[PDB]
Amino acid sequence: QKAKIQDSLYCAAGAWALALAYRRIDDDKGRTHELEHSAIKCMRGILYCYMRQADKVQQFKQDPRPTTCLHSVFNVHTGDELLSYEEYGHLQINAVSLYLLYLVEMISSGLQIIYNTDEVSFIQNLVFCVERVYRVPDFGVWERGSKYNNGSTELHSSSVGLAKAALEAINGFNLFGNQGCSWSVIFVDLDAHNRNRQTLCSLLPRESRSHNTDAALLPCISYPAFALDDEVLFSQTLDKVVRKLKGKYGFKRFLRDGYRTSLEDPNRCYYKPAEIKLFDGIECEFPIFFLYMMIDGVFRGNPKQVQEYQDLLTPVLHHTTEGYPVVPKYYYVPADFVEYEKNNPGSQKRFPSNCGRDGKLFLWGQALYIIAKLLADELISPKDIDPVQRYVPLKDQRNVSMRFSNQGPLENDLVVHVALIAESQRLQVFLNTYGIQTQTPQQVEPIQIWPQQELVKAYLQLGINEKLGLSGRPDRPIGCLGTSKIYRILGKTVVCYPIIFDLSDFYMSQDVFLLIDDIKNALQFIKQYWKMHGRPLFLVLIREDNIRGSRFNPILDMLAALKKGIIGGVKVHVDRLQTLISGAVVEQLDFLRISQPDVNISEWKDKPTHEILQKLNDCSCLASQAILLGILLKREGPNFITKEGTVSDHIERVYRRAGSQKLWLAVRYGAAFTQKFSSSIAPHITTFLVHGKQVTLGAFGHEEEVISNPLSPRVIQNIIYYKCNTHDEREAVIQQELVIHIGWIISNNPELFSGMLKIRIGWIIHAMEYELQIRGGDKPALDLYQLSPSEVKQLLLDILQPQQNGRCWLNRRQIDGSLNRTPTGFYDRVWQILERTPNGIIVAGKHLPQQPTLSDMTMYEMNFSLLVEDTLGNIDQPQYRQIVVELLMVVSIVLERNPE
Amino acid sequence: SNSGVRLDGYARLVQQTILCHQNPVTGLLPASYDQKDAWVRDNVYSILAVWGLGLAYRKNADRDEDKAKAYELEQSVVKLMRGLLHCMIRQVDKVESFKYSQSTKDSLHAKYNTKTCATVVGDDQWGHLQLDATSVYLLFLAQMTASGLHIIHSLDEVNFIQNLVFYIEAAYKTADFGIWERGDKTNQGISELNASSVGMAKAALEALDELDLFGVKGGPQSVIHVLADEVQHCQSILNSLLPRASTSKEVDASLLSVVSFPAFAVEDSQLVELTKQEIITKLQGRYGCCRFLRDGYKTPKEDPNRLYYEPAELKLFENIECEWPLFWTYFILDGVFSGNAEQVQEYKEALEAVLIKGKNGVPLLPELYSVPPDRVDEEYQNPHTVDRVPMGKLPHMWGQSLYILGSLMAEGFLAPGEIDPLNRRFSTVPKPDVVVQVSILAETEEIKTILKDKGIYVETIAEVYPIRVQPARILSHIYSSLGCNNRMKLSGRPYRHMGVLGTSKLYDIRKTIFTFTPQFIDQQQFYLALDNKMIVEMLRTDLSYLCSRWRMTGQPTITFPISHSMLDEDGTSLNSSILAALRKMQDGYFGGARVQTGKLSEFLTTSCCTHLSFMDPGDFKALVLQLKETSSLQEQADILYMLYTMKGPDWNTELYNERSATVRELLTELYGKVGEIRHWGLIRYISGILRKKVEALDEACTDLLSHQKHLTVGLPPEPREKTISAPLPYEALTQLIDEASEGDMSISILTQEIMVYLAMYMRTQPGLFAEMFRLRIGLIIQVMATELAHSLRCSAEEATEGLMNLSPSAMKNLLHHILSGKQGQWQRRRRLDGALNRVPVGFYQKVWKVLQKCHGLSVEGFVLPSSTTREMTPGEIKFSVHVESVLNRVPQPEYRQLLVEAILVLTMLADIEIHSIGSIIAVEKIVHIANDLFLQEQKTLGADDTMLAKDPASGICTLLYDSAPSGRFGTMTYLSKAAATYVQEFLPHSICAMQ
C-alpha cells in the first residue's frame, strides 16, 4: 500500500513518449488515445494528492521545517497518508521540481491537465515555496542523506540543479495551452534564480561535503535536467564519476555504501559508527544507469558509446517466461564470498535479486529501458521528446533567453543605460551652474517614480485565494535586478531606484566613499548577471544634503567620470529619461484589475529620576544625553514620558540628530538602543556556509556561539541580542559593520580570505585594535567607536593583507593566529602523519586515537578536519598555535622525505 | 452587441448562483442549505445551465477570451462528471453484490460525502435505492459524450460502465423507495414500483446502444453493448401504468419529467395530452402545484421531530399540501421545446409573480409556501383561497438551473437541436410496418424428401457449411463473458434467457456467420414444445410481436427447422397443422404480418449483422433387480421415485455392471420413451421428480401484478394461503411455490402451467378479467376438477385422473371456457359465481355510499364499523380487501351470492328514502325473513312438502336457490320486501319515501 512519486512519474513519461511515437500513424486505432488518457489521469491524481494537503503548504511558506514538510508517501487506495513523518522524514524537493518540469513539458506538447483558475494559484504557491530551496537542507534522492546515516539533513547539488531547471522552464509560459490572455501566466523572481545558480556553481565539483561523488549526479547533468552548461567541468565530472563508480554489473550508488548488502540486517535503521568501514567492498550494482548513459550517448550523437553500453547490457538482461526483457533492481554477493571478494575486486560473480526471475519487477527500470530502446531504434527524434529545447548545441547558444547573452558565451560587453534625476530645483540649478545636467522630478509628469515598498506591496497582493486560504508572495525585499525593469500599474508606468539611495537609519550611508564603492559594486553586479533582452535601466538620485560644503568635490569627480562614459571598465549611457522609456519593453502587472562626556554610568546610576530629567533638559552634549536616555530606559522603561514626548520618540529623535551630525559614537549608541538590524545578514551567513567556512558570533574573551547550518533570522537575532545584553553596549553595530565588510570583500575578493576556516569577529576586532594601538605609538590609541566607516574599512583591508616583513614577526604571528589562518595542505599532512603514527598525537591535554579516526573518516572528509580544528582550538596563545602549526609542518615534511 | 451583453449577464448570474459552491478537487457541490451532503440527482441536474452556456459561447466565440470562457466551463463540467464517477467507482463491491439477486442491503448509497468522498451513514439509516438518479446520470453522460466533451479516460471505466448497465437493466421488475425517498404513499417505507424509475431507465438504456466513449478516435472495443428486450419490456410496463404513477398514488407530478425535456420515453401522444390535462386539473394551485395528494411535509401538524407517520391520516393532511414551483418551471420548458409559444408566455407571466428578489437583485426560487398555522379551518371549506408564506430552505439549485436554462433557450441563443444531438425529440413519428423474413431447413434427407413431395423446396442442415446453427443457450453462455475483469473483481453479465429480438439478428464470430433458433422450440426444458398447435400459436404470437416493434435496422430473420417430433405417428409425413402453417407462411400472409420465404444466400445481402469483438483472443439390490425385471411405466416411475427419496438422490443404482447408471441418469433416459407414447399421465410426475422450472416465470408474474391484481398460491384454508402482493426473485418465488404446494408435487407444475396460460391470455384479451379482483389458483383447480367430475358423472379421483391426462391445449380450452362463463341449472351458476366471487363493477362504491348513511353492516357477529368511511377512499385497495374479508366469512358460495344480492337490493332501496337509520343492519335476518315469506307464499299456493325441502346445513330451500333473479316470482322481490320490513322495524313510525 506504499507508493513513491518518482516511479509513477517516470512511467507516465514513458507512456507519453510511446504515445508520441505512435502518433505518427493516421490509422493508430486509438492506441495513442489510451496512453494520453492514462498520462492525464496520472497527472490529475498526483495533482489531487498534492492539493489535498493545504495547511502544510501554507506552513512551509512561512517557517520551513521537517514538521511542516509536504508529505511524499501516501496510501494508493484512497490517496491518504499511511506512515508517520517520524520514520521517513518526508522532506524531498526534487520530486516537486521534476513534476513541475514534466507537467510544463506535457502542456507545451499539447496535452491539457489544468481545469480552472485555482490550479494556477496552487502552482504559483508551489513556485513560491520552492523558490527558497537553496537554503533548507534536504534528505537526498536516496532518502539516507549522510553516508553515516544518523538522521541529519544536508545540501544536495542535484536538488538545486533540478529546482533551477524548473525555474527556467516555468518562466513566462501559458498554462492553458492554445488559448490564454491574462489568467494563465506565472511570474518569477530573478534574485532566487541567481542565488540558485551561485549555489550550484559553488557546490558543483562536490555533490556534498560528506560525499566525494555519487551516482545521483547523473540525472541532473543528463536528459532529465540538462543543467550543466560548462562543457569542460561537465566533462571532468563525467570522467571522475565514470572512473570512480564503474562496475562490472552496473554503476554503484557511491563508495562505502552498505545498502541492502549481505552484512546488512533489518534491526537498526541508523548505522552504528565504524560500520561503514566494514560495509565497503560489497556495494550493490544498479544496471539502470547504463540506460541513462546510453540516452546521453544518443543525445550527444556518439554511436560508439551506445553500442558499447548495449553490448554490456545484453548479457546481464533477464527474460520472462515469454522472453520479455527484465531489469533487476540490485545485485548482491552470497555470504560465502564476503572475504574473498575484498582481496580481488570484481573477480567473483554476484547473484540476481528477487525481482529478476518471476513475480517481481521494476517499473522504473522497465520504463527507462523502453525509452532507451525507442530512442536507439530511431523511431522518434530528440526534438519530439524535448519540445521545450532544454538541450542546445554549441552553435545555437547565441540568442536564447535566461541562459546566454546575445554577445556570445565567451564575451561580456554589455552596455547599461543610466538615468539622471535631480531632487530639488535649487540643487538642479546649482549643478547646472557647474555644467551638470539633471532634471527635476516635476518635469517628468507623464512618468512617475515610486519607492521599492510599492512593488513589494503589489506583489504581496498577488496570489490570494479565498476558497483555500492563500497569503500570496511573502513580504521580501526586491533585488537590484528586479528594480532595474519598468512596470505598468493601472495604466501608469512605474519606475524604482535601488535600495541604496533610500534613507537608512544606519551611519555608513553618510560616507560618500561607501556610496561610491557600493554603486560601483551594483554596476558590476548588473553587468555580470544581466541576461534579459534589452538594456537595463539604472536610476540615480542626488540629494542637497549630500554635498554638505567641503564634501562636494568628489561627487563632481564621480559624476564627471559618469558623463565621460566609462566607470572602471564599465560602459554607461546618460540621456533624458523619457527618451529611454520610449521604444522599450515595459513589464505588465494585470492581476490588480482582476482582483568627552561629563556623565558616568556609575556616578549617575543612583541619581533620582527628577535629577536625571533636569540634567537631560539642561544639557547640550550628545553623549551625556544618550547615556541619560539609556539610564532612563533601563530603570523606568520605554513607555516613560519625558519633556520631549515618549522615551522611544526621544531616542529616535536624538538618534536621527546624531546621524545628521554624523558623530559616530552617538549614532552607534542610538542604533544599539533602537535594536535595528540589517536585512542582509542571512545571505552572508548562507554564502559563508556554502563556501565551506564557519562563522562564530560573540565577544572576545567571553562566550561564543558556533553556527554550522543555516538558521532563521529570529533565532540569530535573539542569540546576538542576548549576548549583547550580557557583555557590552555597541558591539552589535560594530559586528554588523564588520560582517557586512567581510562579506563584501569575500564576494569581490574571494582569494583574500584563503587559509582561514573559522571566522570570528571579536578576534578580528582585537586584531585591528592591537594594530591601531601599535601604529599610535607614543600618541594614545584612538577609540574604534569614533572611527569613520572609510577608516574602518581601510583598517580591515590592511589587517586582511597577506602581511610582509619590516614589522615585528611577533605581531605578524599574533595576527595570523587571531585570524586562525592555516597553511595550504595542512589537513592532508596531518592525515598522513596520523596514518604513519601508530600511537597518536596529544596536544593541550586532548587525545586523538588513531583507530576511530581511521575507521570512521577518510582522506578528504571535512569532519576529520573539523575534529583536528577542535583539537587545535584549545591553544590560548595564537602565536603558540602558529608555532605549533609550523612545527607540525616541519615534522610532516621531514617524515615524508625519509620513510626509513 | 446585445447578444454579448445578455451572455455576460447570464454568466454573471450563474457564477453568483451555482458556481460559487463548486467545492474544488472533489467537484461536487453541497446539496443546498447547511446539510453538508451531496445528492446525486441534484448534482446531475445543476449542470445543464452551465453546459448550455458553454455550448452557446463556443459557437459564437471567435475570440481568445470567449475561447477561454468556454474552455473553462467545459473543463469544469468534465471535472464535476469525473468527481461524480469516482464515488461510484469506489464501490464496485456493492455493484457486484447487487448483480446477483435484489436486496436493499447490497445497494449503492444515495448520499455521498464531501472531500475524501467517504460514507456518512450506514445501510440501515436511509433509503439507498434510487434507480432514476443513475439512469439520468448515464443518459446525460451519453448526451455529453455525443456533444464532444471527454469524460472517460481509462479502459477500466468502460468495464465499470458495462457492469452498471447490467446493474440498472432490471428496473422493470425491481421495487425502489422512489424519487421522494419516502417509499409508498404513507410512511414506514415499503419498496414498491413506480413508472418514473422505468421511464428514466428506458431512455438511458436506449441512449448507450452504440455510442463510443472514446469519440471519433476510438477502436474495436469502445462501444457499450445493450440488449433490446429490456427496452420493450420497460415500454410495455410504462404503457400499462401510464395514467397512474403507482398502485398507491392516483397521480404524481413527477410524471412530467418523464413526459417532458429529460428522457423522452413515451408513445400514443393522446396519453400525453390526457396525463397533462389530468395533472393540470388535479394538482394546479395558486402559486404552484403539489407533488401528490395527502403529503404532510412542512405542516403545522404531524409533529415534525417524529417520523413513521401513525395511521391517523383522516383529515389532518387534506387540502393543505403546501406547493412546489418545480412543476411550474417544467411547464415553460415543455411548451417551448416542441411548438408551443402562448403557453410559454402564460407560464412565464405566472411564474414571475411568485418570484422573490434577494441580494444584488437576482431571481430566486423558493422551495414551497406554507399555509399559516392559524387560518386552517377556512381552507377546509374554501380550498386554494388562503394566502401562504415562504417556508424552508430556498437555495434551490435544481429549479433555478432549470429556469435559467429555459430562459436561455427561449431567448433564442440556443436551438433545441444542440441540447440533444441524438435526436430524441422525434419519438412521436409513426413507423409504417416491417416485412419479416423466414427461412426453412430440413433436419435430414428424409424430411427434405417429405417436404419436396408436397412442393416445398428447402435445404438440409448440410450444404450450407459456411453457416452454422445452434440453440440460443450457447448464445447466452457466450454473452455471459462480456465486460469481465479479474483485477477489479468483475464477473461479467449474469446468465439470462434470450428473447426473439436477440436471436433474429445475424452474428459474426471470428469471420463466420452464426444463426440461433428461437427458444420456444426447446424440448429439454419443458414439454410445452411437444404439441404442434401450441408451437403454431407461439410462432404466430412471436411473429406478430416481432413485426410490431422492430425498432432496429434491416429486415429480421427467423429460422424454423423441422425436427423428427413434427412428423406423424407413422413418421412418413408432416402433421396437418405443420403443412397448413407452412402454406400460410407462403403467399405472404400468416398470422398478422407479412412473411417472405427463400434461402439464406439471398437474405445475407440484406440483413442486420452484429460484429462481436470481445470474443477475439487476448436390500436395495433386490429393489434394483425388481426395477430391471419389471415392466410398465407406472411401476418404473414408482420404484424410481421411491429409490430417489430413500437412498438415491445421486447414488449409483449399479443396474449396469459396465456403466454406472445414476438415478438421475435413468430418470432422464425415461423421457425418451415417455415422449414417444405421448402418455400425459406420468410425464408431469417425472417432471415433478426432476423439479423442472419454467423459464420467464418472473416476468409473467410481474405482468399479472401490474394489472392491479392480487395473486394467491395454495389451497385453502389460511394461514396456508399466501399472498404475493409485490414482485419476488426467481429463487424466492420458486421456494414460496414449493412451500405452498407441499408434498403433492404435481400441484406446483399445474400452478406454473395455469400462471403461464393466464399470462399468455391476459395480453391478447384483457377484458375477460373484469369483475374479478383476486386470483386464487387452488380455487380455480378445484373448479376445473368439479366441472370435469360433473361432465363425466364420475368420482373425484376419476375426474382428477382425467384432468391430469388432458392435453395442454385441452387445458387451455377448458380454462377459456371457464373464464368466459359459458334442478341443477341455476344452483350450478350460483355455485360457480360464488366460487369465483365475480362481484359487479361498482359494488364497492355502492357499499361505501350505503355505509355513509348507517352505523355499519354486521354479518354473523362480525361488524364493519362506519368510521372506516373517513379513514379510506373507494379507490383504495385496503377498503376493497376489507369488504372482501368481511364477506368471505361464510364458506358457502350460495350464501355469499345471496349476501351480495341482498346488499345490492338494500343499496338500491336506500336511495328512495331520505333518512338516517342510525342502527346496525344484519343481512342474515333479511335473508331469513325473505325465505320465510317465500315458504309461506308457496304453502299458501298449495305446493306439497316434497317440493319445499330444507337444506342440510343452511336452512334455505333449494328451490329458492333455483329461483331466477327477476320476474314476479324471483328472489329480488322477496329480498326487497324483507329489507323494507327490516327498515320499517327500525324507523320512527314514518318512511316519507319520495323519488
Short mmCIF file of C-alpha atoms in Angstrom, two decimals, chain A residues 98 182 231 262 292 297-298 312 344 386 402-403 484 557 579 629 641 733 888:
data_model
loop_
_atom_site.label_atom_id
_atom_site.label_comp_id
_atom_site.label_asym_id
_atom_site.label_seq_id
_atom_site.Cartn_x
_atom_site.Cartn_y
_atom_site.Cartn_z
CA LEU A 98 10.62 17.13 -11.55
CA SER A 182 -4.05 37.08 -18.74
CA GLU A 231 31.45 21.69 -21.13
CA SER A 262 24.76 -9.24 2.75
CA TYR A 292 20.92 6.81 -18.75
CA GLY A 297 25.26 9.00 -25.83
CA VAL A 298 22.46 9.14 -28.39
CA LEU A 312 27.49 -4.51 -21.94
CA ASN A 344 40.19 -9.27 -5.61
CA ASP A 386 12.18 17.77 -25.95
CA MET A 402 17.80 33.36 -19.41
CA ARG A 403 20.88 31.29 -20.34
CA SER A 484 16.07 47.51 -12.95
CA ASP A 557 34.55 63.69 -9.77
CA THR A 579 13.78 59.14 -24.48
CA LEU A 629 18.25 58.31 27.95
CA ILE A 641 7.11 60.17 29.33
CA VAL A 733 26.72 47.65 15.30
CA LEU A 888 53.81 20.13 12.62
#
